[PDB]
């Protein structure tokens, strides 16, 4: 995955 934050 591409970097993301939830």
């Amino acid at each position, epitope marked *: *995955e*591409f*970097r*993301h*934050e*939830a």
Partner: antibody
Amino acid sequence: QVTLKESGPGILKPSQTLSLTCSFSGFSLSTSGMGVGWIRQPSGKGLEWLAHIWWDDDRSYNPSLKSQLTISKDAARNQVFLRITSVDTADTATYYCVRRAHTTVLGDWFAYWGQGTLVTVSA
Amino acid sequence: DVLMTQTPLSLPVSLGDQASISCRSSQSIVHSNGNTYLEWYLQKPGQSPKLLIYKVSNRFSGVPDRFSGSGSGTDFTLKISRVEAEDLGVYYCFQGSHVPLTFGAGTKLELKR
């Protein structure tokens, strides 16, 4: 105000190495969550994603061009760089600098784009 | 790669018509975190792209309410209730969930005659 500015050499030949600068302001790359990237568009053609670099030196690349790309930064000078080795006509495109965060409150999206820089690869 | 197929690639309209652009991904855009990072960009002749829609159906600041976004999984649509003049250009769907990041090939919103 947030602004991004690309600079490139305009013309270069095949085999040669493309060095592109981007110079931002309005934010710092040091900020946790911040990121800056490159996207391009060949003449009257789609939009191709190239690379992204994160504040904490982490990097994302496009598999097809991975062996040709090197994105780097200088957060003290507000600059992102991208090298492409062994160019050819193919690579003739407009190159865009974009801002993208991986946290919501910082803006997880391609909101900010520069004017972009024209790069023609011809012999 | 995740493929963004837009339909149609050319969309003639009259000013004041409603328009719809389908975008379908070759695989799910739901990031493992919970979110669907599906965006829409507009590029007007000789201009940089501008973000219109993010996470399926969130309008960007400054984007007029005549634009909306809809869909889930691998099936998305942009709608424009009344095409205004300034709306004509090329529209891209984008997925920001998977590496590498991909755009659709672009839908030309052009003038019918």
